[PDB]
Amino acid sequence: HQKEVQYEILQKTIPTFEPKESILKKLEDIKPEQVKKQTKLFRIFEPRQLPVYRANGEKELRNRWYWKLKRDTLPDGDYDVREYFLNLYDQVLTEMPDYLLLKDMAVENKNSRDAGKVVDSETAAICDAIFQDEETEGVVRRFIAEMRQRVQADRNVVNYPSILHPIDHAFNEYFLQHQLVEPLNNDIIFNYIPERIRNDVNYILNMDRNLPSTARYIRPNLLQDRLNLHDNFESLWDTITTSNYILARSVVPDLKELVSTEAQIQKMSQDLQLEALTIQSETQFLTGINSQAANDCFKTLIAAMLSQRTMSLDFVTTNYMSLISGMWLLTVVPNDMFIRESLVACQLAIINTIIYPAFGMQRMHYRNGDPQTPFQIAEQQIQNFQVANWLHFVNNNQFRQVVIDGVLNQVLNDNIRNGHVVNQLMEALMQLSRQQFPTMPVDYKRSIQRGILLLSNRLGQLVDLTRLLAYNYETLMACITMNMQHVQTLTTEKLQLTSVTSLCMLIGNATVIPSPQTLFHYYNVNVNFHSNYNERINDAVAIITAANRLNLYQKKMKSIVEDFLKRLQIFDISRVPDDQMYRLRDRLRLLPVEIRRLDIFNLILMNMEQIERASDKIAQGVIIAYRDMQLERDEMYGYVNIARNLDGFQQINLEELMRTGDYAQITNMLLNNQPVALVGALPFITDSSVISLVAKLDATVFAQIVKLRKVDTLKPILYKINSDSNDFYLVANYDWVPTSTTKVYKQIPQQFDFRASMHMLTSNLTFTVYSDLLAFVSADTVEPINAVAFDNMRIMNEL
Amino acid sequence: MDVLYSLSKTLKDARDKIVEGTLYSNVSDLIQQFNQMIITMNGNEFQTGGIGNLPIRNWNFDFGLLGTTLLNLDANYVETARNTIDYFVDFVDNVCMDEMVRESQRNGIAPQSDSLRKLSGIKFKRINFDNSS
Amino acid sequence: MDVLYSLSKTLKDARDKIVEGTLYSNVSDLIQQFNQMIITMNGNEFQTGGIGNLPIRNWNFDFGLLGTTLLNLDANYVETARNTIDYFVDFVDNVCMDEMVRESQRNGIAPQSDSLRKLSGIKFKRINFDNSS
């Protein structure tokens, strides 16, 4: 019970989904980055006809075209405006197209006299409106009637006329100029296959498909780990290795034509003569020796080596057959693939139960934490060449590190790959079969020696098994795209030495190699996971950098990191330690932003002020000047208390006033009638009443600031006095200058200019984008009987 | 002096790097700095003095930003950039000449021309970038 | 001239910046410019002439692009870049030598060698970048 409690305490800090196997589905549901196509041009502005007024305030008989936000939904408060622009950045990133084909958006130009087309239907509406307008220039009208698209099918190019606001043109032009589609051909697909599988003679790869010059594809972002999650992220790395282990288990092949379990069990029982001994565990000795255990051992070993997930050894010391099999396990599997305690325990059991007793040596008094493993001490303390040489190999058979195609790989000693070292193992244990075991009881000695011979006499089968395991490991490792970082994980995969015995005693001579489709599926899953990892890193970094550069100080990067981890699809975020979350936040902060997202952010940042000042429901500030200032004459309002700039006034930032809560300065200035300029995104009341101006109601909207110590309810008055006012006669029929003591800091809409809005958008006429490159590869395999290893000899030679 | 040097270096980099056909990645940071300079200088009135025979000159800044969305720079981009670059270069040269012809005894290291004194304000500190000469 | 200078400047920057162990962020723009130069020059045949004792040399460009998927440049990247850089430097030196030994009364400002006249076509203007000398 206590063990379960402690293990649950440890596991609650690991974001691994509790039904480990289910992780496989979550890994295989990750698809390639969804290919986004643009259906209409991106627009933030539209041309709109607005009434205009003469200098005397009388509405004119014609409307004028101005640029207005299509969706005017900007909030009040500077911080809220910056949050709105961050949301706009997220929207643009999510809806950013990966490629564009303008012909899809091309529509008939009604006024064209030469069968002209334009992109998009909004451009057609704008062009018709300008064409029908009476105030349009004759030259502009004739150009609309004559402007033409140019479709060059031989060159695969299309140019269309478009009407776009300069910001809209900037966005659409960036989309057109920076598409993610690359030309696709058979050379690209052939090089997409892992290089070591293309060189493997056991796999026949053919290109029985013809790719047109119009074929396209999007390159996966296989950038290596920028977060270095293998370093100082114990829980996240545990989860990553667990997911990789599950996937590798899914792709490891199944053994065929194993030795009959009944025959091998009877052989082992007859040789060991357990019933004749006095062992308290007579039945348990041969339990777990079956074909299922052998397959489980094969899968566990190869998957653990592929995922670089630490393994623990579970064995019963009294079962010396398990130790004899563990000798082979330590011969073939690198010693650093096991948790130090398990390796030490297994090696010490082997030393103190078999090897040292064999040579009449005093049992080793091994001290935990010794820099030397028990086998390292035994190598120096044992004089026999066979056993000492085998011990030397087992001591020095750690993984070697090599970078292939930019991917770090953990590779085996060449003696493991060809299976030759098994001979040495055999040699060593053959010596152990001839040893006296000086003081050991003779029946137990006979049983131990006969088990040693049980393993020894399978030399050919064990060489074949070692070669098969190494070949499978290499072939599946060719499909790994992320660096194989070796880290001792928090939790391990428990490997039963009885399963090792099953694999050693039941392996036949049926070569089983990964299917070409299995290799392609494994490589595709790895590529999808790596690409999603990189893309979500890019998204998180872009959003964090945008929030910091937008001065969104109340933004919590914790939510961004949680969303990033959730989109990685393999983390239960509820079990991520907080220190690791904050370390992830810091490391994400240190990364630079990806070029495309950074360019989009630069566009939004440079156009922020123009977009905000185009809003009709927020003003940029309010000047309280207790002198009487004439109402300005503007074509958009008539008379209006509009400030073109804040020059000549002390500026109080309303956001800073809200954040600090110190209203002493503002209160002192309002009480003493000190001219000031309150700066910040403010809602305003449009007042068309001349009587309101005479009553001076615009100067009565600031006492609530002092009363409530709030600035969120500040709604300055913006007078709009023109002939449409019910009391405009007061302006017209009397000799006076309309004045006010307050002005609203706001901008005037930009006029629509046809010359500045007409652009030519250029794209390709058509192409087809492909996702599964490996579907273009016809992959066959040789007969397993004829499968060869790296040394050009058959994987299994016992035949 | 730092702001004046930054203006001059931005203009020199614009002349050297804004060339037809060049990848925008070769000028992205330069275009960002140039747009920052335009934003900081916009809406400001400057006067270069009438000391000696140097004529009084007035300078206004109401320029638009440069594009940032092309894969390669074209002729239109270069001409649009040059129109602004010529004005900015003329302003910088006139400010430099106005500062070069003035001297003071109490504080000779501080700016002498009113244009450079204005440019020494905090609001122009944004223009400052790489000081390598 | 601008294209030839841009080739020389790109090669000098590749020699100086593409070094083992350097961050890819230190060369991203340089790598993009280098790859653009490779794309533009690939598939083109040049001849540096036999004027005087200068030997006739034929230049063919079939080079792979430099990778863009590293965090720090390694030995493989540097060697792969250096082979191409050596070939391009030899080509540029030969083109410069061919141009230097030529003159004309009519259009002596215009290119004289066949290689530089070919490089004056629009299909090479993409190579053009920072002109700071």
Added chain:
Amino acid sequence: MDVLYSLSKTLKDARDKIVEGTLYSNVSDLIQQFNQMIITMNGNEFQTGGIGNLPIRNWNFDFGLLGTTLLNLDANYVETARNTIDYFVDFVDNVCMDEMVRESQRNGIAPQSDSLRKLSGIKFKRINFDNSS
């Protein structure tokens, strides 16, 4: 030598480009290189000068990284960067002086000072960047 030059070049760029008010885009790559240098040098002990009257200087590197979150550099960023740059510049000057005063008949081209010998290791090769002098 290349690592020492890269240290000096990074420090010169930091002194010239990390200035108050400058756009972060003007330093972003430089900030990445600077942080790489800080990470590489952190946790390393150096000793310079035991020949002639050159004093024995001991150097420890425990510095925090520069931020990447600002739009324009401010006073705090510049002060932190300046402190780190001052320490690194003093270290580089002392290492250069230590190397300049030594000589060898056999391998005079090879590093002579222990600091440069340590810097010639692989663990410092990451510091290497643009070699343009």
